[PDB]
């Protein structure tokens, strides 16, 4: 009917409202602050032990343990200070594209092409690691399992949906529908009240955890979105895409703030994560090297070229001590 | 230096031993991706092996362990998860021959073959092409001509010439002939003649992998 015309008029109204609340870009605002300088960070540790391409990693809230999953059928929980392997949990299905380490540290979730987020209970009796709960109900492929608490987990899949699973029941509480493409990433706000999902429709949507409905939708990318991460203040988030640029948005102004393109990089981004203060935006690329951007001046402030394959997972600790990048050459460098 | 960290490092070393042993065990295991069109003979191929989301079938043949990954269960954008299969031993492609009724499945199979044969990942992974359902294909071609799908087919309306035309028309889609070869085999309903062919077409890639890892070149 005319509802598509009405929707186009409404989107035009949204764009006009956004341009009515825009006065100066972030580059104009921060054109007077001094730059961060070159950020030379060396490889302190190197977590060797996986037998295939590493696709995910999530640091612990204690900023020491990190779980990383690879296609060799296993995800390994490393003591990053001493390069040890605290645990080596073998998967039921070797195809894994995500992993998470619970904030309390008791649980580890991981998911892949098996359409199940399997949650392992670490700090149990009997010494070994057992499946606490295998959450099934997606029809695509899980790209990001992320923990809210020990009992709630938000999983974004390839059926264009996110979901909020209650672990002890196993049934998903709220299903976040509204995307048109596969949802490739997910990132919780620091207060765990909202989150953002970036999908393959070049859009990042801000879902409300407690309600179950999207609040804001951010467009501006030309290609698929492979990564997303909240700014530590909680009122902004970067967005890594296949357009070879990260885009820093913001929630309160509901617009695009900054674009991080560069002529020397042409292939996409597989992982994005801010620093602790948020001034440095570390983005893992698929041209084998990570890039560290001065997120208030868009100047490429560092290069991390320790990998000889695609950097698939990037993670900055909560206290900001180090940034570990794991790639497809089975290595988890820990830069600092 | 180390107080319990000696025992932690010992646990890490035992974990390393288990990881290396499992890597040795699963590095000699043949991985076969299984792709194809909808409602095709893929399920028939899996049934003929003597044993939602991705499905893995394990079977031993000639004292060789094959994991065969039927991944077509999940319907999503293939470009975001096909790089997980960079490094499969072979790609068993499947084509139903006797289908022209969905709104033209053979053209869809050709599009899938063109899209999967020229990936940046699958340059060296050989493609084992299967052409299923020869009897129903022959009945269909004796019932309805090939001109409904390919107008430019010039020749007899018989089995042999049309089958060779379809086989060549699938093979020529590859733009890297020297890196990999399409081992096209007519599956039909033949029993114990398919797995031997899979073994024969996979031993060459295994020999190439042995040559690459042994350091000869």
């Amino acid at each position, epitope marked *: 009917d005319q509802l598509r015309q009405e929707a186009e008029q409404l989107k035009n109204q949204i764009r006009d409202a956004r341009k009515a609340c825009a006065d100066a870009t972030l580059s104009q605002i921060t054109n007077n602050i001094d730059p961060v300088g070159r950020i030379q960070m060396r490889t302190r540790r190197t977590l060797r032990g996986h037998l295939a391409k590493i696709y995910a990693m999530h640091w612990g809230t204690d900023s020491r343990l990190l779980v990383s999953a690879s296609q060799d059928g296993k995800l390994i929980i490393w003591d990053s200070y001493t390069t*040890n392997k605290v645990h080596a949990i073998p998967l039921r299905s070797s195809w894994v594209m995500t992993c998470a380490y619970a904030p309390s540290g008791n649980y580890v979730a991981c998911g892949g092409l098996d359409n199940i987020c399997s949650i392992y209970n670490l700090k149990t009796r009997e*010494g070994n690691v057992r499946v606490s709960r295998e959450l099934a109900g997606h029809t695509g492929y899980l790209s990001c399992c992320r923990f809210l608490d020990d009992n709630q987990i938000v999983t974004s899949s390839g059926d264009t949906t996110c979901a909020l699973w209650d672990i002890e029941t196993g049934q998903q509480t709220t299903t976040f529908t509204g995307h048109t493409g596969d949802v490739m990433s997910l990132s919780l706000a620091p207060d765990t009240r909202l989150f953002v999902s970036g999908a393959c429709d070049a859009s990042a949507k801000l879902w409300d955890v407690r309600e179950g409905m999207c609040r804001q939708t951010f467009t501006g990318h030309e290609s698929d979105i492979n990564a997303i991460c909240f700014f530590p203040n909680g009122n902004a988030f970067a967005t890594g895409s296949d357009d070879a640029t990260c885009r820093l948005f913001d929630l309160r102004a509901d617009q695009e703030l900054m674009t991080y393109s560069h002529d020397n990089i042409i292939c996409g981004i597989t992982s994005v994560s801010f620093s602790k203060s948020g001034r440095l935006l570390l983005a893992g690329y698929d041209d084998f090297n990570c890039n560290v951007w001065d997120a208030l001046k868009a100047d490429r402030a560092g290069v991390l070229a320790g990998h000889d394959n695609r950097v698939s997972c990037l993670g900055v600790t909560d206290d900001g001590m180090a940034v570990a990048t794991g790639s497809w050459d089975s290595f988890l460098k820990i830069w600092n | 230096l180390s107080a319990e960290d000696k*025992a932690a490092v010992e646990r890490s070393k035992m974990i390393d031993r288990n990881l290396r042993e499992d890597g040795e065990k699963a590095a000699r295991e043949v991985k076969l991706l299984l792709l194809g069109a909808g409602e095709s003979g893929k399920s028939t191929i899996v049934k003929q092996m003597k044993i939602t989301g991705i499905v893995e079938t394990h079977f031993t043949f000639k004292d060789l362990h094959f994991k065969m990954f039927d991944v077509g269960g999940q319907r999503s954008e293939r470009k975001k998860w096909i790089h997980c299969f960079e490094g499969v031993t072979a790609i068993i492609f499947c084509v139903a021959l006797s289908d022209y009724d969905l709104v033209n499945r053979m053209h869809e199979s050709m599009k899938l073959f063109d899209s999967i044969c020229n990936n940046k990942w699958f340059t060296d992974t050989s493609i084992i092409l299967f052409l299923n359902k020869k009897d129903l294909f022959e009945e269909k071609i004796k019932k309805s001509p090939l001109t409904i799908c390919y107008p430019e087919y010039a020749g007899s309306n018989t089995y042999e010439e049309a089958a060779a035309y379809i086989q060549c028309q699938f093979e020529d889609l590859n733009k890297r002939k020297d890196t990999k070869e399409i081992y096209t085999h007519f599956t039909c309903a033949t029993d114990t003649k398919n797995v031997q062919f899979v073994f024969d077409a996979v031993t060459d890639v295994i020999i190439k992998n042995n040559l690459k890892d042994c350091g000869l070149f």
Partner: single-chain antibody, 233 residues
Framework: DVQLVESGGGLVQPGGSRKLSCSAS????????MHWVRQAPEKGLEWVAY????????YYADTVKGRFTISRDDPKNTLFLQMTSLRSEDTAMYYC??????????????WGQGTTLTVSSSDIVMTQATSSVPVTPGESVSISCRSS???????????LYWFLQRPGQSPQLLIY???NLASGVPDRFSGSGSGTAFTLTISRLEAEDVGVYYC?????????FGAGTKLEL
């Protein structure tokens, strides 16, 4: 249903030989470093021996280094201590003790039932500040423990373990690395201290909480226990 049950022991002539064997029913035995720890009939605990996982590292107490040998059968989940030349001071109750060592683990978590063994006829000295303290239920009491050497290793954590042994019961882990409560103990207990002086503090005492409290060091082998502070209701 974690269950370590020992078997063997009993009466034996001095200088003879006897084999103890604890079956480990209910947990993943092969991942666990095991210990044998003995308790004299009216004395404190003494560490005897330790096997790592996979038997890659074995330690013995210097007193019994050579007269005892220790082994594990992982497929049948059993731990063996073959005792040779049983002298007069080996009459004791033996417990085989579970212990897993990773980051944030709780070694010495579980203690077996233990079997008695009656015969006929620089070590870090860990010392308890006393041997008995009067106590009433509902009162917070502090138990001190003194160490020969500073247990604060360079990596930050001090290796000291507080155990409680109920009368007629196997000891249970209470506190590991002087601050972390074991899985299954209430939040009453709290440990504190510097690298040398250590203190357990129990608040809001109950009836069944009385027993003998041992402080163990784990910085270096042998793992000398404490003399044992006892609480009487």
């Amino acid at each position: 249903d974690v269950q370590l049950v020992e078997s063997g022991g009993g009466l034996v002539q001095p200088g003879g030989s006897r084999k103890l064997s604890c079956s480990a029913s209910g947990f993943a035995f092969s991942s666990f470093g095991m210990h044998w720890v003995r308790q004299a009939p009216e004395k404190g605990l003494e560490w005897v021996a330790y096997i790592s996982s996979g038997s890659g590292t074995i330690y013995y107490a210097d007193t019994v280094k050579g007269r005892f040998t220790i082994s594990r059968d992982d497929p049948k989940n059993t731990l063996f201590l073959q005792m040779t030349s049983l002298r007069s001071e080996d009459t004791a109750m033996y417990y085989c003790v579970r212990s897993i060592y990773y980051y944030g683990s709780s070694p010495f978590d579980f203690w077996g039932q233990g079997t008695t063994l009656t015969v006929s006829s620089s070590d870090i000295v860990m010392t308890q500040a006393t041997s008995s303290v009067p106590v009433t239920p509902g009162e917070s009491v502090s138990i001190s423990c003194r160490s020969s050497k500073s247990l604060l290793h360079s990596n930050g954590n001090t290796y000291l373990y507080w155990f409680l042994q109920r009368p007629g019961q196997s000891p249970q882990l209470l506190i590991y690395r002087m601050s972390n409560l074991a899985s299954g103990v209430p939040d009453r207990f709290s440990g504190s201290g510097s690298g040398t002086a250590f203190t357990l503090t129990i608040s809001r005492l109950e009836a069944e909480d009385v027993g003998v409290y041992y402080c163990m060091q784990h910085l270096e082998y042998p793992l000398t226990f404490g003399a044992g502070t006892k609480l009487e209701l």
